[PDB]
Structure formats: C-alpha cells, structure tokens
Amino acid sequence: MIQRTPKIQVYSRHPAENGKSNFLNCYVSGFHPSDIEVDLLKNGERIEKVEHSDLSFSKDWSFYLLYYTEFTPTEKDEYACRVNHVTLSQPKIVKWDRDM
Template identity: 50%
Template sequence: MKSILSIVVLGLIYSAVESKESPPKVQVYSRNPGEYGKDNTLICHVSGFHPPDISIQLLQNGEEIPNAKQTDLAFEQGWQFHLTKSVAFKPASGEEYSCRVRHLKNLKTYTWEADM
C-alpha cells in the first residue's frame, strides 16, 4: 500500500512540475563594446525557462549566421533551464544582428544594440 501511495504522490508532483511553463528571459549582447569593422562575438543568453523545448538562432539581417556554438542545456533551481549561443562576427553599419528564440510554440526576435 505504501509503494502505491508513493507512486501516486510522485506522479502528482511530476505533473505539477511539468505543467508549469516559464517563458525565457533573453539577453543579446557582444563580448566587447560594439564597434563597426572590429572582430567581436555576438552572444544570446536565454534563462529561466521551462520546459526545455527551445531553439536559438543568431541572425544577420534575418539570415542565420553559420558556425555558431551553443552550450549544453543547464539546469537551474525551480525546474528552470539556461542556454547560451555565440558566434564570431564583425559588425557593419546598416546591418541588423539579432537572436531568434523559439520556446514551445512562441517565436520572438531580439535585436542587438551596438554601443555606438
């Protein structure tokens, strides 16, 4: 009887955790101050989300920038996750750099602001 009760309680706890959705917090920044024509790294840090069904794209004028690197999915307290994606880039005047994040069925784009 104890084992059946334990299984039921664990199932209820798991269901409560699984049903809790948290949208991601997104930060888009560069490793160094943004200067046109200078090598830099574009970084998109996504945190505080649940469930871990997520994808990140780094974009230049709406097109994915090749050779981006992504960290492993990391677990935070409270059943939330974080992830970082980065790519080398050389900012150019008139170009738009952004991070597109899809979490579950929600898709949002966040634009990098140069420090100029």
C-alpha cells in the first residue's frame, strides 16, 4: 500500500521576540496514510495544550495538518516538534530555529 513520509516544518506565527506572546507551529504535509502523532516540546517535555487543524489533503491526495499552541519565546527556552508515522523507524525530532 502507498506510504509517503511527512515533511516537517517548525516555526512561529510572528517573528520571534523574547517576552512577547506568539504561536508555535508544526506543519506536517505530504504524508499517507493519515494516521500520525505530532507533539510540540518545550526543553524536552511534551506541551499539553496543543491543538490542530481539521484533516485535509492536497491535489495529489497527500494529507496535511497544522499543530499549534500559544507561547512566549525566551532567550534560553528551546522548542521542537516530534513526529511519528509508519514511514519513520524512529520518532523524528526537528528543533525550532527562529531563523527558519
């Protein structure tokens, strides 16, 4: 059966400014089947208040979802997105780089 690996991007809604409210996003796209696990991490621990968009797909039938949560960036706190899917032998972790 068809299986496509998810592309992953971790970024903020607005340019990051320490001490100012924002939203941390993790966009997963181009995957199949739709079964997928996405977590946002703060200094390694799982953030519990995370929401996501309603499942949708592109013209080529691949799925996409946006996971997000409110956050206020600091100079020292580090964030990341952890994803697991049938195409990944191990959970894939991508660190947030305020420049990407």
